[PDB]
């Protein structure tokens, strides 16, 4: 009705200089472990490989990783999660030559180095405890 379906699946093509921009609001903030998850898949089904998972545990930390043939690789984390309950955020994932740069409301919180070329990404999925207003792939 007023927001996009969650979970949300968007076919994409990424190249160096692309930015994936996600606008949404954390909801259900009264539950014990509210989350946001963004997955960059290499094909259209959810069994396919994941070049980059960005999984926020709101108020706690972010965990990032990559999945190949069902197997998760080296996990990376940061406790810098500057989201606000019930306030709209702008989540920007910039595709650089060497990494995905993740900004929350204009502020860099992490850089995840590519394990496979970002041109291999075919779908972005957004899931868990957000209301989703828009997803864009810019440039």
From Swiss-Prot:
Residue ranges constituting the Galectin domain according to the UniProt record: 6-138
TM region positions: none
A Gene Ontology biological process term: phospholipid metabolic process
Protein's cellular compartments: Cytoplasm; Nucleus matrix
GO molecular function, one term: lysophospholipase activity
Chief subcellular location: cytoplasm
Keywords: Apoptosis, Cytoplasm, Disulfide bond, Hemagglutinin, Lectin, Nucleus
Domain of life, per lineage: Eukaryota
Tissue specificity remark: Detected in adult and fetal spleen, fetal kidney, adult urinary bladder and placenta. Placental expression originates predominantly from the syncytiotrophoblast.
One Gene Ontology cellular component: nuclear matrix
PROSITE patterns, alphabetized: GALECTIN
Subunit field text: Homodimer; disulfide-linked.
Function: Binds beta-galactoside and lactose. Strong inducer of T-cell apoptosis. Has hemagglutinating activity towards chicken erythrocytes.
Protein name: Galactoside-binding soluble lectin 13
Species assigned in the record: Homo sapiens (Human)
């Amino acid at each position: 009705m007023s927001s996009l379906p969650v979970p949300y699946k968007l076919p994409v093509s990424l190249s160096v200089g692309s930015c994936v921009i996600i606008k949404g609001t954390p909801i259900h903030s009264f539950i014990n472990d509210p989350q946001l998850q963004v997955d960059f898949y290499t094909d259209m089904d959810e069994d396919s490989d994941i070049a980059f998972r960005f999984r926020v545990h709101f108020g706690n930390h972010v965990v990032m990783n990559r999945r190949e043939f069902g197997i998760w690789m080296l996990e990376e984390t940061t406790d810098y999660v500057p989201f606000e309950d019930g306030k709209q955020f702008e989540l920007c994932i910039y595709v650089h030559y060497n990494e995905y740069e993740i900004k929350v409301n204009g502020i860099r919180i992490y850089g995840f180095v590519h394990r496979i070329p970002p041109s291999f990404v075919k779908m972005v999925q957004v899931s868990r405890d957000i209301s989703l207003t828009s997803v864009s792939v810019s440039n």
